[PDB]
């Protein structure tokens with residue numbers, strides 16, 4: 001099996017000691033091909049980049065979701081929430097059964113108003129900028145997505161558009177996620193050097209737990225019913241076990257929604273706007289749709305569904321730069337991958353999503369080009385060729401939420417403003433848990449359409 005360059009006893013590990021590991025892995029896939037082994041002291045995995053191999057990896061009878069070391073560290077604060085639990089843990093299937101109906105396309109009808117609440121706040125912020133000011137795109141998109149998940153998730157207002165420094169919960173979450181990431185490179189995690197890191201990590205966990213537990217407590221105490229996920233989780237029963245989610249798991253689910261949803265969704269909106277300003281023909285087409293469809297002061301649920309080309313723009317942005325990181329799988333039993341690669345029970349695979357989305361054998365030779373017209377379309381897309389939301393029963397539960405949010409917001413943005421790439425911005429992709437176009441800025445000239 002092809003394998004990248006080695007660093008003696010550290011094997012391939014220093015290759016991910018970099019600000020941009022996913023992009024580094026994409027460059028390794030370019031020179032090595034559809035499969036490569038990646039080794040670290042005491043660990044091994046296999047990175048998959050072709051639809052040919054990924055299609056097999058997506059066979060749930062042969063492979064199940066694995067928690068990468070990253071997710072294992074994130075579990076220290078995300079607990080046995082949906083994102084960081086194993087399929088075979090009682091709490092996975094229990095929460096999946098309870099939550100699935102609350103995340104359906106139909107359920108988006110109930111979240112729409114609160115999504116509009118935050119989206120209007122974003123539009124108003126931009127309406128209120130002075131002539132010689134610009135927009136920090138990923139920064140504002142993250143304010144939007146955090147507040148939207150906060151409001152829709154547990155009826156809590158982070159009020160991100162009222163501050164420079166985020167709500168302490170947000171600061172703690174971002175810092176806990178960065179520390180979970182830092183542990184990946186620590187050969188001696190018990191070194192005194194990390195004592196402060198550990199102290200801060202426990203502090204950040206407490207900040208998050210305290211806020212969420214308080215909100216849950218407050219809600220049970222009042223008996224208040226809201227249009228949020230928390231109300232669903234307090235009222236829900238798993239048809240299988242007949243059990244409701246306990247308070248601690250509910251807390252983990254709320255933290256999980258924020259971890260899994262905020263940056264992935266923010267990144268999507270940021271990349272979508274990036275591609276639009278770099279492809280003014282596409283922007284014109286999307287803006288025509290936005291103006292024709294969104295005829296009311298605020299968008300209705302029905303109208304968002306009709307933003308078809310905006311949806312296509314978003315899928316094409318997800319094709320080129322899927323914002324969620326490569327996901328991990330393990331072999332359920334001994335099995336041979338692609339007729340060439342025997343695997344043992346427990347062997348791990350990684351699905352290198354951005355590479356899959358550039359499989360010139362699936363998409364044609366023009367994979368690097370931004371063409372929403374690819375998604376006209378749809379479902380002609382070969383099965384397992386487009387996987388920004390993961391796979392099977394362990395796919396993104398929030399997919400309908402993310403797309404409704406992104407379509408609504410992008411539509412409003414295109415209805416309300418003309419955008420200028422005033423710096424001729426050079427794409428620079430920052431990686432945290434997720435990808436974003438770092439330092440992407442634009443100027444927005446209002447079309448002066450009232451809300």
Ligand code: HEM
Pocket residue numbers: 065082083084096149256257258260261262264265268322323324325327328387388389390391393394395396397398399401402
């Ligand atoms: C463009 C935005 C998003 C993208 C690209 C994305 C991507 C993904 C991917 C790839 C997975 C599978 C991870 C794995 O196999 O380890 C996943 C799972 C998940 N996502 Fe999303 N996500 C997005 C938005 C959201 C939002 C907004 C929410 C919540 C409101 C959310 C909640 C979850 C949860 C709970 C899981 C675990 C589901 C389960 O395994 O039962 N995501 N997401």
